[PDB]
Design a protein around this ligand. Structure first.
Ligand code: K
Ligand code: K
Ligand code: K
Ligand code: MG
Ligand code: MG
Ligand code: MG
Ligand code: MG
Ligand code: MG
Ligand code: MG
Ligand code: MG
Ligand code: MG
Ligand code: MG
Ligand code: MG
Ligand code: MG
Ligand code: ZN
Lengths: 136, 177, 117, 94, 66
RNA sequence: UGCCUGGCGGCCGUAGCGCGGUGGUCCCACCUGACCCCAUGCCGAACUCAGAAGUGAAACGCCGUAGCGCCGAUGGUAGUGUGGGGUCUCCCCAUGCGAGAGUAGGGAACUGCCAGGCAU
RNA sequence: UCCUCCUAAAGAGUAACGGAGGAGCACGAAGGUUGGCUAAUCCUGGUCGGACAUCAGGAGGUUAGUGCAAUGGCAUAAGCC
RNA sequence: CCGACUUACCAACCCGAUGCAAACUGCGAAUACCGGAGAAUGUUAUCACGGGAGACACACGGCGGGUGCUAACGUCCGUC
């Protein structure tokens, strides 16, 4: 499951998720799944969607995961009050903005690529759309 | 110096005809000769560094510069500023005199001497060679040596490449293998 | 480094200090065959007086131009021209040479010629 | 071969350009050569269908501009981040 | 040369038993009697010692002949 | 007055790197010698001194060359001050400001004072 | 109690049992001044010598250094002799 | 001894493409702030000194944020 092998700091501010994505274009495969909504992808969600599409293509072709979950999310345990310092790190997320290409694929028919991405999108919280590599 | 005149009157002119250099200034020249003893055991007994320094003095005829550790290395238990070796750099007349002694009397005394390796060049016409034991130099009295110790010779030249550097040395009958 | 850049490194700190002080500076330049002197205005950009061994008027007096005797000549010569323009006080800029030999012979000749520095 | 109709833009900047895209237009710029850049607006749906053909980027296009015609090649395109829409196109005179 | 620090350095004659006679500078006062010099050292002739090790059939034919 | 060279500056990559060519009458560099003025944690390498037989080999100037560095529009986009609105984690409208990146293209610096050689 | 950074919204300041690290000294030289010098790392060639010691050359160009945290500085060096 | 083949694997540096950063920056706004000049408007709206205070439990709403679960009519800051 995706995590940075090491990080300079352990905990991070919440921040905000304004703006539109860089990486709007298919760059390695011929087909891809593009984010249309906005939100967080957790490492678990990314992995679940990955497993879904590879099963659909029976491991044929190649798959690129374009997003990486590098942001640590903390939570406090149950029955604890406010204060007493920042909670412990629980899981890692990637911040998604509209337009980001999440996955790419090639080496399979388009009519199979659509089916594979349909199965994967069902695992992701954000809405997504199928896109193809343009000339230029 | 004797070999210096041999350079001026023969080596330079034959090299000119060999490589077809356009200017006499283009012909390679010997710039310096440097002797190094990496004593090392000066980490134990400083008299060893002194005794090694006396040997370079006798061989070279000038007081050696003792060389300090560039940086600490735990792999050898050396701290920075510890004496590790000593060097002598020879230039001008005393360079040619040593160079003459080395060829004419010193290297003949090497055990099982078959000639020096012709490939011991750094890639830019500087030749470097080790000697295993000090006794090749008659200035060291065999009856009085404390310990075996070798040294490195390095010859620095204005040559641009090993082919030019090798030609320069061979012109002195520098005994390549 | 080449010798020229190394010398210019040595020269820089004194030159900057003199610029901040706003002094008129006497700048020597030395060469194996020749020696030069210039007096430069406080802006550093215009030459009020020059003297050099390349001038026939000076070289004609000399056995050889690359020695302390020639340097003493230009030291007298530059100081005379400077006083003829009233530039009595200057700061000596040794331009990164050692204050030795020819450069000292030039400077202390100019002092005896009445230049204040 | 592909032929396009365009109009010179009367106003430029953020607000003007968004009003175009609300009106099913989109802006474009012609530059290169010696003449100054010429700013034009294009009918979106026509050009969107044309640029679907791979020849659109390789072949020489011609744009008729208010009585002139100019021969150009598509130099760059800004696509909308996730909708199938064009934001802007650069043409270089050819 | 810093005048004080360096050892005595002196011209000495050298003589090799091959009859080569030479003059060098040295840090010693002795005349240098030599057993070998670069002139008489055998390096340019002696290599044959190893080539004699390569033969084999020119040994056995002695036994085969006898 | 033109060409070249040296010094002191303006300026601080359109000015710096790479690759190719080229210069020694002057100038500059390398260079010759070192007992001496001076110097080497050792050494005339450097610094210094006395010189002028060579060489422009190196270096340094000059010239050519876009393989790089560098510069860089127009248009669009992002962001945003003020007023208003929505489906209010984030957006939109009116008006003002408006990048960064990239693109077309530019680009192998320009210039002041003093001095010397050559030509006039 | 004191120092450095972020939070802190491009002047200053700005809270929380917010996120990260240090101090409670050292040095008559580690201060003054004059003169000089320029790093890490890596690749080649060399006695013992090894992945790593001292030596020569090259690439590189400050990625080193700063008595002790971190930030800002430093080639005219504030770094080294 | 030196060392060859092969890989069911991993693979630094360098090179080409693609992203992320409160404690990264070879870039870089709008605003805000400091200083100067000018016109109009404003019951001197400014500063100094002196007499008398009260207050030092704040609340919500917008915008920028830390904490919390981008939970709270939660909590702690900036500005209106
Ligand atoms: K250039
Ligand atoms: K701050
Ligand atoms: K009052
Ligand atoms: Mg607007
Ligand atoms: Mg501030
Ligand atoms: Mg502010
Ligand atoms: Mg100093
Ligand atoms: Mg620092
Ligand atoms: Mg109170
Ligand atoms: Mg209360
Ligand atoms: Mg209170
Ligand atoms: Mg409050
Ligand atoms: Mg409240
Ligand atoms: Mg809050
Ligand atoms: Zn002999």
């Amino acid at each position: 499951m995706l995590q940075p092998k090491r990080t300079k700091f352990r905990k991070m501010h919440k921040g905000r998720n304004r703006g539109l994505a860089q990486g709007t274009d298919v760059s390695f495969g011929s087909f891809g799944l593009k984010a249309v909504g906005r939100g967080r992808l957790t490492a678990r969600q990314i992995e679940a969607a990955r497993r879904a599409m590879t099963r659909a293509v029976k491991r044929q072709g190649k798959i690129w995961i374009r997003v990486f979950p590098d942001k640590p999310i903390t939570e406090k345990p149950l029955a604890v009050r406010m204060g007493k310092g920042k909670g412990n790190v629980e899981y890692w997320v990637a911040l998604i903005q509209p337009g980001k290409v999440l996955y790419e694929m090639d080496g399979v028919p388009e009519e199979l690529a659509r089916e594979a991405f349909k199965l994967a999108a069902a695992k992701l919280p954000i809405k997504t759309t199928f896109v193809t590599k343009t000339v230029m | 110096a004797k070999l210096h005149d041999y350079y001026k009157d023969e080596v330079v002119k034959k090299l000119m005809t060999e490589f077809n250099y356009n200017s006499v200034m283009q012909v390679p020249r010997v710039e310096k000769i440097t002797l190094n003893m990496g004593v090392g055991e000066a980490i134990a007994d400083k008299k060893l560094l002194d005794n090694a320094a006396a040997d370079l003095a006798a061989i070279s005829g000038q007081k050696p510069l003792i060389t300090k550790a560039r940086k600490s290395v735990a792999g050898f238990k050396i701290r920075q500023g510890y004496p590790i070796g000593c060097k002598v750099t020879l230039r001008g007349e005393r360079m040619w005199e040593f160079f003459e002694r080395l060829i004419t009397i010193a290297v003949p005394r090497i055990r099982d001497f078959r000639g020096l390796s012709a490939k011991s060049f750094d890639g830019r016409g500087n030749y470097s060679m080790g000697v295993r034991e000090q006794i090749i130099f008659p200035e060291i009295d065999y009856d009085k040596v404390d310990r075996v110790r070798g040294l490195d010779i390095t010859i620095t030249t204005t040559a641009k490449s090993d082919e030019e550097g090798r030609a320069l040395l061979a012109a002195f009958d520098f005994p390549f293998r | 480094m080449d010798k020229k850049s190394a010398r210019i490194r040595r020269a820089t700190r004194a030159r900057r200090k003199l610029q901040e002080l706003g002094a008129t500076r006497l700048v020597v330049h030395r060469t194996p065959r020749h020696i030069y002197a210039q007096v430069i205005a406080p802006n550093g950009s215009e030459v009020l007086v020059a003297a050099s061994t390349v001038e026939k008027a000076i070289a004609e007096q000399l056995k050889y131009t690359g020695n302390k005797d020639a340097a003493a000549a230009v030291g007298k010569a530059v100081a005379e021209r400077a006083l003829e323009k009233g530039i009595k006080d200057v700061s000596f800029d040794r331009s990164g040479f050692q204050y030795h030999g020819r450069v000292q012979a030039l400077a202390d000749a100019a002092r005896e010629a009445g230049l204040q520095f | 071969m592909f032929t396009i109709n365009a109009e010179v833009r009367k106003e430029q900047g953020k607000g003007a350009s968004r009003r175009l895209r609300a009106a099913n237009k989109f802006p474009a710029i012609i530059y290169g050569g010696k003449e100054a850049p010429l700013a034009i607006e294009l009918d979106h749906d026509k050009v969107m269908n044309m640029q679907a053909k791979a020849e659109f980027y390789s072949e020489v296009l011609t744009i008729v501009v208010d009585g002139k015609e100019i021969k150009v090649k598509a130099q760059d395109v800004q696509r909308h981040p996730y909708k199938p829409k064009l934001q802007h196109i650069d043409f270089v005179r050819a | 040369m810093k005048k004080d620090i360096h050892p005595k350095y002196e011209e000495i004659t050298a003589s090799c038993s091959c009859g080569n006679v030479m003059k060098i500078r040295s840090t010693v006062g002795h005349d240098l009697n030599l057993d070998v010099c670069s002139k008489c050292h055998p390096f340019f002739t002696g290599k044959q010692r190893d080539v004699a090790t390569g033969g084999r059939v020119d040994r056995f034919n002695k036994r085969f002949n006898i």
